[PDB]
Ligand binder design. Sequence first.
Ligand SMILES: Nc1ncnc2c1ncn2[C@@H]1O[C@H](COP(=O)(O)OP(=O)(O)OP(O)(O)=S)[C@@H](O)[C@H]1O
Ligand SMILES: [Mg+2]
Length: 252
Amino acid sequence: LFRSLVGTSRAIQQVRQMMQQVADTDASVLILGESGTGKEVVARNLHYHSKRREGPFVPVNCGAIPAELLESELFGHEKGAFTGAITSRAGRFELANGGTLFLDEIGDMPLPMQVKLLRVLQERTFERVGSNKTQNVDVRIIAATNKNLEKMIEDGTFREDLYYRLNVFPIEMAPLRERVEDIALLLNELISRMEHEKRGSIRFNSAAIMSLCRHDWPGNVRELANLVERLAIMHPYGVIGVGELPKKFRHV
Ligand SMILES: Nc1ncnc2c1ncn2[C@@H]1O[C@H](COP(=O)(O)OP(=O)(O)OP(O)(O)=S)[C@@H](O)[C@H]1O
Ligand SMILES: [Mg+2]
């Protein structure tokens, strides 16, 4: 379903309270933060605590999709619309109807698609590729990004009108290095996940934890999770001390 946002930091306690406020509303939510800072966790929780909780949760990875197939991927197509179209699609939007659409890295959505997304947010309608059957769509938008959208507006790479439409309820995720007090609790959570799934077990002694609390965590919680996995393989059911950490994680 959805996992919980572990932590005792002021910043994370804020996020939970903001989540509870906006969740069972239909406001568009924009979640900002570095890679691996729990942005999808926040999005999934928002959904399953929402009026749409029994509806579908439909991700769109704005980075991945090739722009040639992008409009098609998001809005579907009747067959004939272009080449090779001999089986048809409802787009990610139609698939999300009565549910939540999670736009992962909205900063990577190309300008022409930003315009079409604004239409959905405004007119709540859309066109399948090559069609004129203006179908209506009933989705809640949650978007996430690690980019500086306001700068992109200035650069002309992101639309101001879309921005103000999407950024009704922003939620900022603090990077791990700004919430180091949470690292021990995160470890406990990550190790407990690992045990539940028969994938191993470790624990960290206080020396190791101190050193981890001084790490920069450019990959944030996903990097933290990666280190836990690796240490469980190298030292199964072992205790991790400063010496068992890789050199880049030692800070003494
Ligand atoms: N506060 C948290 N409590 C528990 N698990 C967390 C927390 N923050 C992140 N995680 C976990 O850390 C991993 C990465 O979190 P995600 O939500 O996928 O990150 P993200 O911000 O969406 O980064 P990207 O854009 O997908 S790289 C997942 O396995 C999450 O379950
Ligand atoms: Mg993600």
